[PDB]
Amino acid sequence: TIFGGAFAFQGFFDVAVNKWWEEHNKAKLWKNVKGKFL
Amino acid sequence: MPTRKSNTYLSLVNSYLIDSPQPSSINYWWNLGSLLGLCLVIQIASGVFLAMHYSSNIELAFDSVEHIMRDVNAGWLIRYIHANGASFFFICMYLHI
């Protein structure tokens, strides 16, 4: 019963943090840099 | 009698954590004790999750630690939790004393 809210909070915080982290570190990630070294 | 006082295990848990009559005037310095307990617990937990991947052999010890850091999922997290939790355990113990 409790697991529902816990999972909701986990998913919400995970998605928000991931989006913010990727946006803030954008230029420094491998995914965005690979194209230059292709 | 409430079930928390009749059952022996719940009776003990009650006597120690539920109706334990603490003085009303105790400030936050009296919460270090429980903190230390938590520290011990986490250490033990981390320690166990390190024993599952650590090798006691001298030639394999350090290499096994690096295996934990680099290859084991969350191995770095548990290793650092254990190492820094030793220091934090002693910080809590020094403030305790």
């Binding site: 915080f13 995970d14 943090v17 991931n18 982290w21 | 009303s24 850091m69 680099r70 770095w76 997290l77």
Partner: protein, 46 residues
């Protein structure tokens, strides 16, 4: 420190969650202690 990226990201998640828990615990403690914080006494012997 190959885990550096993931280490700092997990640290961010942990800080967010623990800070939320800490603020909630402060609120709940000041809450539970209002009856004792606001407690008064009177002492009226003959």
């Amino acid at each position: 420190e190959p885990e550096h990226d993931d280490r700092k990201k997990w640290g961010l998640k942990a800080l967010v969650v623990l800070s939320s828990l800490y603020l909630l615990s402060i609120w709940v403690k000041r809450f539970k202690w209002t009856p004792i914080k606001n407690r008064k006494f009177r002492f009226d012997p003959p």
